């Protein structure tokens, strides 16, 4: 062979947040916030100090998380939901096993309507009750009837199967062309390789060998992923689930399309800037094309969903989506699907995330009294995922052909 490739199943597990200095760095940050707080009057809050960004909301939530998570199942940041509808009121969402009348809650349990954080920036606190295939020509094509491979296509390891998310290329090294899907779909620890096939692996049925997972990430610290401390727990991780599969050397890349079937041509990834106005993400209509539920549409309901489970480990998921018109946004098997902003002004729809859709990252949510609870879906921030995997999205077939010729 020409160059040396890694020939070992090799695993690195996080230890940085377990260094006394790394925990002290987080403790010092919140100690600083606490030392300077000087909370405002028993009273009125100025409008210019109202939170106006994801980062504004996430810092208020982190600062007040002990009281917030004492009698709740989780929190996220977004807009207050009132009578089932999104308002334009910036808010921390507090998820509860069941919303009950104030009269059945002592004052310690009853959430406040307003929280003021460090620097005087304040926001609303909203209470949301919360818990943790299709037949069409499109679904047929995604699962094997189509002459091309692309976003939405079924991708299968020996064990599980999911949805190809995007056509991508490595920024460094061999600069190989491949695809992005989620890590759980693509990986099984009982095997030394992770081969992927479309539509099925040889033990289960017909299919072409697409290539094998080269690298994948599951957990990333919040301070590395978001650039801030998103909570006070020294062990805080984002489920940054993602796997990169370089196309096999004898796989015909001319069968790959960069089009998202059912959507059309998409634009470049839209990064989530934590400092821009909330309404460029929260409340935006999204769509996804998956091998299980085909094309669906939904609403981004919240960002940076937090969950505290068995040990003193805090877990974040980036994007919370609910399907429109009381239809589920996804099903099991849609994991890896691209989460795409629908066009507002005629611009190409742009991807913002990839469906996580896994172990505990699908559940139910209650919005109205006249109808049953609704499924919610979780997504990983795509701009951040591409950064950690060091990949670029390829959005045109002309750019795909250039990228193939430029592999080394």
Q: x/- string (CB under 6 A) for ligand ATP, residues 163-192?
A: ------------------------------
| CA quadruple 188, 190, 193, 195: dihedral, nearest 10 | -40
Stretch that binds its own copies, among 210-218, 277-285, 328-336, 339-347 (CB under 8 A): 210-218
Residues 125-144 that bind Mg ion (CB under 5 A): 126
Question: Residues 6 or more apart from 401 whose CB is under 8 A from it?
Answer: none
Residue 279 interacts, among its own copies, Mg ion, ligand ATP, none and using kind-specific CB cut-offs from 5 to 8 Å, with none
Please give the Cα distance from 228 to 237 (Å, whole number). Answer: 12
Phi, psi torsion values for 63, nearest 5 degrees = -60, -35
Residues 290-349 that bind ligand ATP (CB under 6 A): none
Residue 81 binds to Mg ion (criterion: CB under 5 A): yes
Residues 43-102 that bind its own copies (CB under 8 A): 71, 96-101
CB 102 to ligand ATP: min, Å: 4
Q: Out of 43, 44, 104, 107, which residue is the one contacting its own copies (CB under 8 A)?
A: 104
Stretch that binds ligand ATP, among 92-100, 214-222, 312-320, 326-334 (CB under 6 A): 92-100
Stretch that binds ligand ATP, among 76-84, 167-175, 275-283, 308-316 (CB under 6 A): 76-84
Residue 340 binds to Mg ion (criterion: CB under 5 A): no
Q: Out of 75, 181, 221, 233, which residue is the one contacting its own copies (CB under 8 A)?
A: 221
Residues 8-27 that bind its own copies (CB under 8 A): 8-22, 25
Residue 81 binds to ligand ATP (criterion: CB under 6 A): yes
Residue 213 or 278 with smaller CB distance to its own copies:
213
Residue 308 binds to its own copies (criterion: CB under 8 A): no
- Total residues at interface with ligand ATP (CB under 6 A): 18
Residue 13 or 36 with smaller CB distance to its own copies:
13
Residue 140 or 309 with smaller CB distance to ligand ATP:
140
Beta bridge partners of 364: 131, 375
CA-nearest of 50, 89, 51, 92 to 72 is 92
H-assigned helices in 116-193: 137-140, 183-186
Q: Tell me the C-alpha to C-alpha distance, in Å, between residue 399 and each of 19, 62, 243, 394, 406.
A: 44, 42, 22, 6, 10
Residue 192 binds to its own copies (criterion: CB under 8 A): yes
Q: Out of 33, 132, 175, 219, which residue is the one contacting its own copies (CB under 8 A)?
A: 219
3-state DSSP assignment of residue 360? coil
Residue 206 binds to ligand ATP (criterion: CB under 6 A): yes
Q: Tell me the C-alpha to C-alpha distance, in Å, between residue 370 and each of 55, 83, 226, 366, 373.
A: 35, 11, 38, 10, 10
Please give the Cα distance from 254 to 404 (Å, whole number). Answer: 10
Residue 212 binds to ligand ATP (criterion: CB under 6 A): no
Residue 132 binds to ligand ATP (criterion: CB under 6 A): no
Residue 192 interacts, among Mg ion, its own copies, ligand ATP, none and using kind-specific CB cut-offs from 5 to 8 Å, with its own copies
Residue 311 binds to its own copies (criterion: CB under 8 A): yes
SS percent in the chain: helix, strand, coil, step 5: 20, 35, 45
8 Å CB contact between 30 and 229: yes
Please give the Cα distance from 356 to 368 (Å, whole number). Answer: 26
Please give the Cα distance from 142 to 161 (Å, whole number). Answer: 12
Residue 148 binds to ligand ATP (criterion: CB under 6 A): no
Phi, psi torsion values for 57, nearest 5 degrees = -70, -40
Residue 121 or 156 with smaller CB distance to its own copies:
156
Residues 99-128 that bind ligand ATP (CB under 6 A): 99-102, 105, 109-111, 126-127
Q: Out of 57, 76, 96, 301, which residue is the one contacting ligand ATP (CB under 6 A)?
A: 96
Count of CB atoms within 10 A of residue 176's CB?
20
Residues in the chain: 408
Residues 2-61 that bind Mg ion (CB under 5 A): none
8 Å CB contact between 61 and 68: yes
- Contact positions vs Mg ion (CB under 5 A): 81-82, 126
């Amino acid at each position: 062979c020409t160059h040396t490739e890694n020939s070992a199943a090799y695993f690195l597990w996080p230890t940085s947040n377990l260094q006394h200095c790394a925990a002290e760095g987080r403790a010092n940050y919140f100690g600083n916030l606490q030392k300077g707080l000087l909370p405002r009057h028993p009273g009125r809050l100025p409008k210019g100090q109202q939170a106006n960004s994801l980062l504004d909301l996430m810092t208020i939530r982190a600062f007040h998380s002990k009281i917030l998570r004492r009698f709740s199942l989780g929190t996220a940041v977004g807009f207050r939901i009132r009578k089932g509808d999104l308002t334009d009121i910036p808010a921390i969402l507090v998820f509860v096993a069941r919303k009950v009348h104030k009269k059945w809650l002592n004052p310690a349990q009853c959430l406040p309507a307003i929280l003021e954080g460090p620097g005087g920036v304040w926001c609303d606190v909203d209470v949301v009750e919360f818990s943790y295939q299709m037949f069409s020509e499109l679904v047929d094509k995604l699962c094997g009837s189509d002459e091309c491979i692309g976003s939405g296509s079924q991708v299968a390891s020996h064990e599980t199967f999911g949805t190809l998310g995007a056509i991508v290329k490595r920024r460094t090294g061999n600069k190989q062309v491949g695809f992005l899907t989620n890590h759980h779909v693509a990986v099984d620890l009982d095997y030394p390789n992770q081969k992927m096939f479309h539509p099925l692996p040889p033990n289960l049925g017909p299919g072409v060998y697409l290539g094998a997972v080269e690298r994948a990430t599951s957990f990333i610290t919040d301070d590395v992923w978001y650039g801030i401390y998103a909570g006070t727990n020294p062990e805080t991780f984002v489920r940054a689930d993602g796997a990169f599969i370089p196309f096999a050397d004898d796989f015909d890349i001319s069968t790959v399309t960069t089009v998202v079937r059912g959507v059309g041509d998409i634009g470049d990834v839209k990064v989530i800037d934590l400092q821009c106005p909330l309404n460029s993400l929260i409340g935006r209509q999204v769509c996804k094309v998956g091998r299980s539920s085909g094309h669906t549409t939904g609403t981004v309901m919240a960002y940076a969903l937090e969950y505290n489970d068995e040990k003193g480990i805090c877990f974040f998921t980036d994007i919370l989506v609910v399907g429109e018109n009381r239809q589920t946004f996804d099903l099991e098997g849609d994991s890896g699907s691209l989460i795409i902003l629908t066009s507002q002004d005629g611009e190409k729809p742009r991807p913002i995330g990839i469906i996580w859709g896994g172990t505990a990252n699908r559940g139910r949510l209650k919005l109205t009294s006249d109808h049953g609870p609704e499924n919610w879906t979780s997504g990983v921030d795509l701009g951040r995922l591409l950064d950690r995997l060091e990949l670029d999205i390829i959005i045109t077939n002309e750019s795909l052909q250039d990228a193939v010729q430029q592999q080394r």
